[PDB]
Amino acid sequence: SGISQTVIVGPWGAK
Amino acid sequence: SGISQTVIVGPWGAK
Amino acid sequence: QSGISQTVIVGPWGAK
Amino acid sequence: SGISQTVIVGPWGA
Amino acid sequence: GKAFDDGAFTGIREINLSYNKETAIGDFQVVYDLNGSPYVGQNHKSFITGFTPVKISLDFPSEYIMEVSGYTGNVSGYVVVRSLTFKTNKKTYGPYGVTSGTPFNLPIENGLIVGFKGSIGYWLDYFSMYLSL
Amino acid sequence: GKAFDDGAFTGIREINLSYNKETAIGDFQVVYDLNGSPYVGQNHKSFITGFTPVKISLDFPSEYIMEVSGYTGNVSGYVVVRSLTFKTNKKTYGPYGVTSGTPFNLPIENGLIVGFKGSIGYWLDYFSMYLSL
Amino acid sequence: GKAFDDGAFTGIREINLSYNKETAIGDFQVVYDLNGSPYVGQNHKSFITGFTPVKISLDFPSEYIMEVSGYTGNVSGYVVVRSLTFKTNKKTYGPYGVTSGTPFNLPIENGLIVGFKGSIGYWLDYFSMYLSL
Amino acid sequence: GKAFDDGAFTGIREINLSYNKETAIGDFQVVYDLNGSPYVGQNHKSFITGFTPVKISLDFPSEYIMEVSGYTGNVSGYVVVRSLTFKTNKKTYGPYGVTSGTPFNLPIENGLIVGFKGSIGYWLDYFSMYLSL
Numbered sequence: 001s002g003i004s005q006t007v008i009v010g011p012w013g014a015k
Numbered sequence: 016s017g018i019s020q021t022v023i024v025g026p027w028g029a030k
Numbered sequence: 031q032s033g034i035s036q037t038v039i040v041g042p043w044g045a046k
Numbered sequence: 047s048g049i050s051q052t053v054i055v056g057p058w059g060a
Numbered sequence: 061g062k063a064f065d066d067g068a069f070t071g072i073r074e075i076n077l078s079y080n081k082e083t084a085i086g087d088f089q090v091v092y093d094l095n096g097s098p099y100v101g102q103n104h105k106s107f108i109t110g111f112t113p114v115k116i117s118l119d120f121p122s123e124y125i126m127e128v129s130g131y132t133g134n135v136s137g138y139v140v141v142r143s144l145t146f147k148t149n150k151k152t153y154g155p156y157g158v159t160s161g162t163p164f165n166l167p168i169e170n171g172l173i174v175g176f177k178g179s180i181g182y183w184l185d186y187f188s189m190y191l192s193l
Numbered sequence: 194g195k196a197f198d199d200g201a202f203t204g205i206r207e208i209n210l211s212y213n214k215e216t217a218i219g220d221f222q223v224v225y226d227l228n229g230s231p232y233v234g235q236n237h238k239s240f241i242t243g244f245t246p247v248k249i250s251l252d253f254p255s256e257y258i259m260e261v262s263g264y265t266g267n268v269s270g271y272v273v274v275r276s277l278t279f280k281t282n283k284k285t286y287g288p289y290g291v292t293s294g295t296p297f298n299l300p301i302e303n304g305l306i307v308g309f310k311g312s313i314g315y316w317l318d319y320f321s322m323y324l325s326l
Numbered sequence: 327g328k329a330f331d332d333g334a335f336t337g338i339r340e341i342n343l344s345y346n347k348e349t350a351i352g353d354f355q356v357v358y359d360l361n362g363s364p365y366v367g368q369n370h371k372s373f374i375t376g377f378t379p380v381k382i383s384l385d386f387p388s389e390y391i392m393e394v395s396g397y398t399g400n401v402s403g404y405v406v407v408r409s410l411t412f413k414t415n416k417k418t419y420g421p422y423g424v425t426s427g428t429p430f431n432l433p434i435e436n437g438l439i440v441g442f443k444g445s446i447g448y449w450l451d452y453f454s455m456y457l458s459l
Numbered sequence: 460g461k462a463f464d465d466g467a468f469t470g471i472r473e474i475n476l477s478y479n480k481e482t483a484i485g486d487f488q489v490v491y492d493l494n495g496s497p498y499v500g501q502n503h504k505s506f507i508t509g510f511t512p513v514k515i516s517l518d519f520p521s522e523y524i525m526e527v528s529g530y531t532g533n534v535s536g537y538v539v540v541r542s543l544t545f546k547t548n549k550k551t552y553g554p555y556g557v558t559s560g561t562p563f564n565l566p567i568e569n570g571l572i573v574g575f576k577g578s579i580g581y582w583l584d585y586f587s588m589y590l591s592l
């Protein structure tokens with residue numbers, strides 16, 4: 001796909 | 016510099 | 031998706 | 047710095 | 061709660077949040093950097109009011125966040141983010157909100173927080189962070 | 194020419210450029226993706242006018258650029274980008290301009306063009322591309 | 327302790343660690359992937375012996391870690407990593423060690439752990455992780 | 460010819476290639492950096508002999524490649540890489556080979572070449588570069 005990706009960390013909190 | 020970089024998370028623990 | 035980390039790659043130059 | 051970096055290739059042209 | 065996702069940007073210029081010490085984090089909004097200019101993110105508001113406002117204005121790009129930490133816990137039967145702290149290379153902002161429940165912390169040795177996503181009901185239910193070089 | 198630098202975004206939705214058969218590429222403007230919404234880039238305009246406008250509308254996000262090619266050459270004493278072609282996974286757009294002089298090409302095996310920078314005087318003098326995953 | 331830094335690789339094939347049910351994490355070694363082939367990392371050893379070894383063998387590349395969690399706290403007057411758990415998209419490995427002290431956890435929504443660094447004396451003193459797409 | 464793919468590393472320490480002043484590039488081999496240690500890449504050998512070797516030893520990590528350029532053209536009826544030049548922040552190495560046919564160039568404004576892949580028969584058929592921050 002033509003969409004750039006980034007690292008994401010988390011989530012913290014509720015489900 | 017000629018050294019490749021990367022995201023680093025932490026440290027957890029002492030110090 | 032995968033346990034394999036990804037890298038930009040440019041090219042190729044030469045025969046296609 | 048606080049500014050995110052990206053690979054940049056070129057320039058072409060001059 | 062209502063999910064939000066700001067996506068990723070070039071950096072962070074300011075964070076406006078709110079909290080109540082009886083409960084948890086309420087509102088959350090961020091002015092990001094986008095290629096050199098301020099980008100005013102949407103204000104993700106609690107469904108209620110009564111919160112104390114906090115404005116964390118960073119000396120961008122000299123100043124950047126090196127650690128985000130906080131507490132999650134049960135408020136009135138809901139697991140929510142009760143407190144947040146933002147440490148930069150210049151000083152510490154927070155804690156905001158009561159430091160009770162289960163701690164978490166994300167120190168960054170190399171790299172930048174460049175975006176936030178999450179969900180806010182009466183309180184900030186959960187959040188995640190985009191990281192980049 | 195006047196230097197320009199859009200910086201980096203999430204992807205590309207449309208490219209608008211202009212060219213003249215007698216000379217070289219004139220104006221250049223990109224509609225980027227930014228976190229799933231369109232972001233209309235600055236329009237980088239020539240100091241002069243009379244060029245033929247072209248609009249390349251990509252079917253974002255399934256369509257993306259895989260190769261950018263062109264020619265540089267002398268026009269009225271200036272070395273400029275005389276021609277551009279943009280190849281996507283779907284089709285080829287171009288060449289636009291004059292295919293004379295020295296060729297260049299950047300094919301991409303893995304990754305995405307997410308921004309442009311360069312300089313425009315009477316014509317597009319040169320340009321570079323931001324690449325990301 | 328002795329500091330160690332494996333640097334960054336292409337992903338993770340195995341983790342070998344050791345622990346003691348009364349104390350903390352002792353030894354830590356990783357078999358990384360490097361460009362589709364195993365790379366056997368340095369074995370980072372505690373100054374003492376007597377630990378229970380565990381081998382965590384991942385079905386690389388389809389199985390990868392999505393969360394690292396554990397506890398830090400005091401052992402003989404030193405803050406050390408008392409417990410670790412590694413959650414993949416397939417299974418949970420752990421907890422190994424003693425689950426008391428202060429919890430921490432790094433869930434990953436997008437991206438991979440590609441390296442570890444840290445320090446080990448009698449026990450794992452601290453550690454960080456390299457993250458990458 | 461025979462495909463090769465070194466993968467991606469942390470940097471480049473040395474490039475050992477061979478070429479013929481009357482034909483194209485033949486053998487290609489790279490000593491990479493891998494987290495501070497030299498990584499001796501496989502030697503990718505031409506199917507034939509009669510080349511002149513060259514050793515490009517970089518002052519890693521202070522010296523690094525800023526532009527790869529060269530020429531592709533016909534040799535015995537095959538489109539091959541006829542010539543290569545490596546410019547670093549310190550000096551220029553090359554041209555090696557025959558400076559004829561269709562030019563190409565990959566200048567880098569930000570980032571690093573961290574790997575090569577390609578194919579070699581009697582001469583270097585084609586190649587690609589891994590780029591990273």
Ligand SMILES: Cc1cc(=O)oc2cc(O[C@H]3O[C@H](CO)[C@H](O)[C@H](O)[C@H]3O)ccc12
Nearest residue numbers: 061062135136138140180181182183184185
């Ligand atoms: C404290 C309290 C008082 C009240 O009258 O109603 C609610 C309703 C709540 O639910 C919403 O907020 C939650 C926490 O942020 C969660 O998002 C839930 O899905 C929402 O419905 C919470 C607290 C109340």
Ligand SMILES: Cc1cc(=O)oc2cc(O[C@H]3O[C@H](CO)[C@H](O)[C@H](O)[C@H]3O)ccc12
Nearest residue numbers: 194195240269271273313314315316317318
């Ligand atoms: C008077 C005149 C006539 C002509 O045909 O071209 C030019 C170009 C000029 O320069 C501007 O465009 C250049 C090529 O793109 C370059 O960027 C320069 O820096 C611009 O000022 C000026 C006058 C012309």
Ligand SMILES: Cc1cc(=O)oc2cc(O[C@H]3O[C@H](CO)[C@H](O)[C@H](O)[C@H]3O)ccc12
Nearest residue numbers: 327328402404405406446447448449450451
């Ligand atoms: C339990 C115990 C008993 C003893 O006689 O000496 C030590 C020394 C210790 O310190 C070493 O391990 C620490 C935690 O891993 C830390 O690395 C320190 O720098 C080491 O020298 C620990 C325990 C002892």
Ligand SMILES: Cc1cc(=O)oc2cc(O[C@H]3O[C@H](CO)[C@H](O)[C@H](O)[C@H]3O)ccc12
Nearest residue numbers: 460461506535537539579580581582583584
């Ligand atoms: C000069 C020459 C003479 C001949 O009889 O056969 C060949 C075959 C060649 O092919 C090999 O090298 C090519 C270019 O490097 C390409 O890789 C091909 O797939 C190889 O088989 C080359 C030269 C010849």
